Design a protein around this ligand. Structure first.
Ligand SMILES: [Zn+2]
Ligand SMILES: [Zn+2]
Ligand SMILES: [Zn+2]
Lengths: 247, 245, 179, 247, 245, 179, 179, 247, 245
């Protein structure tokens, strides 16, 4: 409540500029801030990645160990995603989205992580750790999680399943989160821009540009007109971010 | 197995046909507003506890009422008895469900107060999330809390490559996508989306076609919603002439 | 049919004047609640199929004194007579001595008390309570020695256990379980 | 504190009518309100029932699945009873009472729910979900719970145990809760009569009119004379109730 | 296997014999009142923290003191090392035990205060719940908290068709019934029932015949409680005459 | 034997008058606490084997200054000298500048500091305190700057750390850890 | 090198006067923060690498009105223009109608508003605020009828949707998002 | 806060006596209060002991039951220590220290507690239950814990393994906790003395006077010279306490 | 398996040699103070949130700031994915850590305030507790919060009978003793012990010698800390000259 005073004035500013068709830092309404992906940042981890989205920082680590195959899928691997935003409800929504995008795009062939039909199956733990929250930890974590899985090494030797091999990854889930303000949208909102409210839309695309997951959040009404425009711009934005994994 | 055989889903419904719905307002005596709703195998019950005082003073708001929404599944609502209490899924559904009404309720009329929505799924099938929202919107009107309009909700699935309205358990477990929607109905017409969520794989085109399929279903559901409140209107009406009679 | 659902368009904000159960947006009036639409004297209002009470200057309310200050008495207004629903503007109401028995009584203890359930009237935007009519007044009091329920004995309120007789503005409904 | 005002006044009313030996609604001191029992309200469940007691409403679901029994009793089925009164203290007591009636009356032959002696056994979950609390959710939940078990179908097939059959029920436990005010007792108290205080006595009887369980809850002293009297009444009310299971 | 062989029970007691009892008041130094009690193999200790200030202000009652009672079993008090932390059984025992005392403590004498009662069982056997209430009641007198009278409790069991006073573990685990009581004791006599609970299967007569077998043992227990406070009375008395000596 | 257990009948509500450690019900007097039954001039009371002290006019009390409102000092009374058991009527008491010192003192911050531990004597119901006498006063204070416990030096309190110096109604037991 | 780390000995408390970023102990001056050690006029201080602002006399502040008494205006001070780091001595300051615009306005409720973001100036201590300058005043007023934020139009704050207008001391940076 | 008034004064008193080289009861600074060790106070426990240190009283019970050894250390028995003080951050610390002393001194040979290679192993539960807190519940608890273990009977013939035997205890861990005040130390502080603050140093020693565990708790700076002296003093205090186990 | 072979440890360092250390201040934007730290294979990140208002009123100390310290291990920081959330070991570490700063931080200057220290270990090895302390201490200076001086921490272990500085994972697990230390440093000298703990088996003589090895190590680490802050001082300096440039 005492923090709100500074934020509210920051809100007036972001709106003062929105009326004049601009953002605080000069970006375009569909422009992400500089993205930096750094894999293998946690050696003891089977896979890992640090992603920087503007000043926003997040690190994802992956751990693999055998064990529990779900009763309904005793022949399908397992992927668990968790996040820590050092509230709970948010940290939970963040983990679920990242997970949905990985799950629905089938980025990781869960059938290949089988070891013993319904007895032992590889279990992939994806843990998201936020370091610096400067806005849109969601996209950063999504970029970091897929980047981490792509740079993951199955710990076969350490156990008894033979030679170690890279985790078979077949898709590249990416998500664009936009801050909706009235009938205007702002892709990749910064912490400052969020001072307007927590009204956002998140679209997740796969290799082929198929929408794999969508999530609208906040106490706001989403104009269907804007949603259509944002649906297009978003698939585009995800594609351009996807070529950041190429080089 | 096979989801669509000769234009008919595994229950006889067409790609654009809702499941049998039922709606009843004022079903709970101890509650400012309530509503029993059914959507296919889904049996849901919403309760609303009007603009009251939020007791733990810290969660109070000096300009508007806070809205709380609790989506809970009974341990006997699913196929395999589910341990009672908040699930991560439940927490999620409660967060988004509360966000759909936060935009609709005129919470600014009741500062420092709280309007709590409680929805309980006694029997679960696919779509309970949308059933509860429909059920809650009725209960909110029954409770008479000011709103910009109604909240109607439906999910659009996708089976065997074909978009379907109001998906059932099997089309939700074996389909290629599921997309719950909730719209604000104002003046008998879809105006905006209150709740949008999707999981699966759909093309940019299919998403747009799915919005359409859903708005058709919402108007259909909204009608059942006005009907249920109409009966209520009669009850409180012929109830006044009751004491006079 | 006068029936109306929340969201239904009532007309332009020009011709009609926003009233209870109605709101404006984009220059248009819609019902905020379900019920009968009444457009009388330029004013459009909707009779909610479940109104939310509002304590207003002139209403009979049920309250309980939370604290006394030798003059100004704080009474916790809980509900408006007529409607079972709890009002929206519930809160603390102040009852001054001048408005107690249109008589001459000092202090306050000789009429009010502590934790005692009261039944006064509303007069003043600040839930300013006033008790003048014989219908109003303490409806249920407790002794200070045994905290036991006090029974009404004629023109005074006596106690069964201890026997300490207490006096204070009694309400003809005192002990009736009604108000 | 703000709700206590209307409850105290309502209390003054209840006591006043009690003085003239009359209950708020005219009912007789040993008469339950309208009792309605509806089985199979929840389908996907192997057993279910809903009970209306006056304006009081309760639904009970019965679930079943093979499981491992208590190491103490290697040869016997398992029955767990829960309740959600959508505080926790009261919700545990209500579940335990209903529970005790079922267990002590031996309404369910736990020896018949054994699969692989010492390994698998039928675990019967009984969840009580209060829908409308208008007083005495207990008797309502006891009725509902027993009704629900009598209408239970063991899902033998679903688990490859073959051919479904009814859950053999051999007794009908029925509890009668009364509110105690001084020396007078009010059977099947309404939520409006409970404004007097949460002082009650509960007696559960079996098929043969024997006491299978008892429970007095609340901050009050029970007169022994009153008890003996009410002990008979309760056993009688049980019979008048236990007949609504016949027709 | 039989529980009653020739009038004698497995431990040699007669159907109407309390197990050996031991009661000592003022056993703890940092506590307003306290008591060490032993019923058969039950080893229990109670502590009372006299009229004190209840911290979370929302639990504070403006007219009367609030009573809290906590039954808790030591991880090492049962044959199978129990895991610390409130049990459903424990929560239940505490609630019913608190009620037994709310009915006697003169709470209207200390508004806004709290009288906390902690009772710990160091070694459990059947009826620990009974040992605790007895211990507690002694502790309360030791702490000097105004009461209508004393609280005495005992359980009646049923073994091989026969009622038995103060049942042991074996009887409780293989008998036909278990029924703990607690009475308010004014004027050296049993006045009313403070705590009543039954499990098993008993006839209308047996139940009534159980109260008699319970009040008989209670009076005996009560005399023991009274001797424990009388000794304490000597101790505070010769302790005063000590400072001057 | 004069020993009585709680619940023991002392006599009829007609015979004697209800005193300390005794309660009435059904027209009969009983003992509520264990102890020696004493009967002085028709008044039956019981001396508890564990008396719960009550702060009354004349008692020496120990307290903390929780609020310094101009010409007013709200003291957080917690113990009654002579008994270790927490007193039944604990709460906030009041100290007026007029009672700070039998002498002449302006302001209150000039004698009673915020958070200070005080030793005062009750001179009026509702925990009305008086620092008049020399045996009364502040027993421990903290430097307003460094918050270090101030050591007594002369008739003024001094901070050994920052050397600040404040003056106040110092009890002659300041720093002895005894009151 | 003027750089010092916390703990570095600066000199005896005899040779220098303890200044900001320095503490004394055993008659020795040490650095409490890391930064540049400066000794101006016998006064040794350290320029912190991350100063923690202290809202002193004469600096511009920013706050939200917590409650408007009839004459005194209670403001919740939060920041000190020129630094993002929340200052140390934050809390609630006081604004008296006498300090609004050098003009003569009676009520304070119409000068400032409840929950209005204000841009004041420090007068002396305990956060004594003033707003009689153009640069100072309200920065964001919320409508009392529709609860929405109001836009500026001339010298009035005209609500965009409800139309209601309010008049209160407005800052020249109103609605700018700057201060 | 209110209980603080009384404690702050008590604190002034103790500090007054320190300034005059005295402890409030007249003890020496390296002198423990009277110690009393009474084993077998809980017969339904494989082992147990009550310890009285001055007025401080503590009971420790020891329960043993077969279970699975940790994955990392098969061929190794298990010892789990837990404490109950009727805050938690203090209860955990007290248990961890007690536990640390037993474990680092190897008072019980865990290798001898193996039942089956890496499947069945004896699990030792040491639960500490504070009875009366008059200061230094830690040293008291360490005393009772090691005493209970010394009087432990492995319940072999209850799980059908073999014959019963006494738990082989190979060492005698004793911890000495001191209250550090300024530059002074007070061995075995009492609740009264503890009013000065919660700044202590604890040194646990073994049979050969080797330091087995150490722990300084509280917000304060421990002087190196004071520590060096407290070291020797503590080793010696432990030797004396250790003797109470002989006779 | 021998830990010391020819005066060298499995990684090649001598008994009195630190593992390679890397320290960087101001690495977080949304924190008042911070520092990244690498100690051997320990990757630790510290964040400090300058004197801010403590929210739960009951935790507000009228006379001084309150210190809170949270040591936490990322699920991926260990060999076997660790369940996120506090455990007994972390709560403990958090407590002694809180206490090490309670004596150095000048809390009396910020009444009713909170100085919250958060330390996360991204990759763990032996000594993480030590690494976090050094990180936290740098973070606190980066945040400019007043302190009597620096806090430098190192642990000493015992391997094959020899005391070794800054033990590694194999040494802590297979050695004979682990002893984490932390000192207060003023005027470039070890002044006092801020944190002390030990587990294992050491002779009185080895304990005193251990204090000596840790001091030699800590001074070396202190220098590295001073350096990280020196650079931070040079970067904010050339920053103030940047805006003017
Ligand atoms: Zn009375
Ligand atoms: Zn000072
Ligand atoms: Zn407006």
């Amino acid at each position: 409540m005492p923090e709100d005073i500074l934020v509210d004035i920051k809100r007036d500013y972001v709106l003062s500029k929105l009326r004049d068709n601009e953002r605080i830092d000069g970006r375009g309404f569909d422009e992400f801030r500089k993205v930096e992906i750094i894999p293998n940042v946690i050696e003891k981890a089977e896979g890992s990645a640090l992603v920087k989205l503007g000043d926003t920082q997040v690190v994802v680590g992956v751990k693999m160990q055998p064990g529990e195959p779900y009763p309904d899928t005793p022949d399908r691997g397992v992927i668990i995603v968790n996040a820590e935003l050092v509230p709970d409800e948010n940290s939970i929504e963040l983990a679920r989205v990242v997970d949905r995008g990985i799950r629905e795009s089938e980025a990781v062939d869960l059938s290949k992580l089988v070891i013993e039909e319904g007895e032992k199956v590889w279990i992939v733990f994806v843990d998201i750790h936020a370091l610096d929250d400067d806005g849109n930890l969601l996209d950063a974590s999504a970029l970091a999680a897929i980047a981490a899985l792509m740079n993951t090494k199955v710990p076969a030797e350490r156990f008894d399943l033979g030679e170690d091999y890279l985790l078979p990854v077949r898709d590249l889930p990416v998500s664009v989160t936009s801050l909706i303000v009235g009938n205007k949208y702002l892709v990749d909102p910064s912490r400052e821009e969020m001072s307007v409210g927590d009204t956002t839309l998140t679209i997740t695309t796969d290799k082929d540009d198929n929408v794999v997951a969508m999530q609208k959040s906040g106490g706001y009404l989403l104009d269907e007109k804007l949603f259509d425009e944002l649906l297009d711009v978003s698939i585009n934005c995800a594609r351009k971010l996807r070529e950041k994994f190429k080089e | 197995e096979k989801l669509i055989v000769d234009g008919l889903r595994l229950d006889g419904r067409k790609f654009d046909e809702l499941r049998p719905i039922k709606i009843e307002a004022s079903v709970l005596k101890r509650a400012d507003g309530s509503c029993y709703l059914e959507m296919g195998k889904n049996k849901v019950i919403a309760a609303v506890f009007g603009p009251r005082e939020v007791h733990p003073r810290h969660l109070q708001d000096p300009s508007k009422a806070i809205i709380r929404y609790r989506y809970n599944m009974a341990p006997f609502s699913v196929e395999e008895r589910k341990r009672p209490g908040p699930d991560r899924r439940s927490i999620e559904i409660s967060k988004v469900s509360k966000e759909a009404f936060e935009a609709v309720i005129m919470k600014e009329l009741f500062p420092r107060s709280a309007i709590d929505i409680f929805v309980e799924v006694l029997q679960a099938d696919a779509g309970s999330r949308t059933a509860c929202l429909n059920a809650a919107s009725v209960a909110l009107v029954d409770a008479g809390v000011p709103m910009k309009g109604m909240i109607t909700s439906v999910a659009v699935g996708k089976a065997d490559g074909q978009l379907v309205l109001d998906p059932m358990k099997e089309e939700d477990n074996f389909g290629e996508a599921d997309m719950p929607f909730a719209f604000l109905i104002r003046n008998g017409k879809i105006e905006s989306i209150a709740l949008l969520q999707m999981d699966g794989r759909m093309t940019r085109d299919e998403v747009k076609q799915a919005i359409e399929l859903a708005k058709k279903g919402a108007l259909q559901i909204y009608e059942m919603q006005r009907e249920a409140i109409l009966r209520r209107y009669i009850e409180v009406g012929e109830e006044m002439d009751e004491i006079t009679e | 049919m006068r029936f109306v659902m929340p969201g239904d368009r009532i007309g332009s904000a020009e011709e009609y004047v926003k009233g209870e159960g109605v709101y404006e947006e984009g220059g248009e009036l819609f019902a905020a609640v379900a019920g009968k639409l009444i457009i009388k004297d330029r004013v459009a209002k909707v009779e909610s199929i479940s109104p939310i009470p509002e304590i207003v200057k002139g209403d009979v309310v049920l309250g309980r004194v939370v604290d006394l200050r030798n003059s100004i008495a704080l009474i916790e207004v809980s509900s408006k007579k007529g409607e079972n629903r709890g009002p929206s503007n519930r809160g603390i109401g102040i009852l001054h001595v001048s408005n107690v028995d249109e008589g001459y009584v000092k202090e306050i203890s000789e009429a009010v008390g502590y934790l005692d359930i009261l039944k006064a009237r509303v007069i003043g935007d600040n839930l300013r309570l006033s008790t003048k009519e014989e219908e109003m007044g303490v409806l249920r009091a407790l002794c200070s020695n045994c905290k036991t329920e006090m029974v009404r004995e004629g023109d005074i309120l006596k106690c069964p256990e201890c026997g300490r007789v207490e006096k204070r503005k009694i309400s003809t409904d005192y002990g009736k379980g009604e108000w």
